[PDB]
């Protein structure tokens, strides 16, 4: 049962999921004195106005806000991409104290948490087919910097008491995922992987340069979730981040530089 504790955490994942030691694993440190420009890169296009959130679910690893991805209500295009990517869900990673918790780092700096907006390439018909392809998935990562409380985020945090344990779900309508974005969408990109098992090497990462905020009090709420199901031994989600993995000569590109 993979997790984040000392016996089942990231340093052990390679036993059941050997791709953990792969060529294109995520997250990574983004060293900003090593980032390259590429005139092929474009502005990020996030078309989220019509998005329809459905529900929030404690999956035993984090919690996911699920979207209707049966059509193009919430899509990602451009940036480094060459197709149309539908938003299926977003979730977060966070740490046990506010000084740590992001998966990506920027010149070794750790934010308090990181938002992952997970998308899949429509041409593959569904998420599972897409997850097996190098160009199949695209994840937008947004740092959460501890400081000012964030009203958009509060709406997510207000629902977490309804999904405290694994397998619980709650209705969650009308949440605009764009409300969790910075105003300007400058980004870094590189080829990588999912940051949880199965760790599949199918993700084009788009990591936004500008964090959104979170308060220290808000951060407490993330840590109240339970990894386990009702009636099982409790183990709170105090931390659920994978550390930086080796870049292995992949190119990190930046837009606009
Ligand atoms: Zn994630």
Residue numbers in the entry: 4 to 260
Quote the study on this structure:
A well-studied carbonic anhydrase II was selected for rational design as it has efficient CO2 hydration activity and could be heterologously expressed in Escherichia coli. Thus, to better understand the key factors controlling halophilicity in enzymes and to develop a halotolerant biocatalyst for hypersaline conditions, we undertook rational enzyme design by selecting just one of several mechanisms present in halophilic enzymes: increasing the incidence of acidic residues on the enzyme surface. Herein, we describe for the first time the successful redesign of a mesohalophile enzyme to an extremely halotolerant orthologue, that is, one that is active at 3 M NaCl and above, by altering 18 surface residues.
Crystal structures of WT and engineered enzymes were obtained to confirm the presence of changed residues, that active site residue positioning was unaffected and also to compare the overall structural similarity of the designed proteins with that of WT. The structures of the four engineered enzymes superposed almost perfectly with the WT enzyme (maximum root mean square deviation (RMSD)=0.42 Å for M4) with no significant differences apparent in their secondary structures. Some of the orientations of other surface residues of M1–M4 were also altered compared with the WT, although none, with the exception of N62D, were in the vicinity of the active site. Up to 18 amino acid substitutions were made to the enzyme surface of bCAII, but this did not significantly alter the secondary structure, catalytic activity or stability of the designed enzymes, compared with WT, in the presence of added salts.
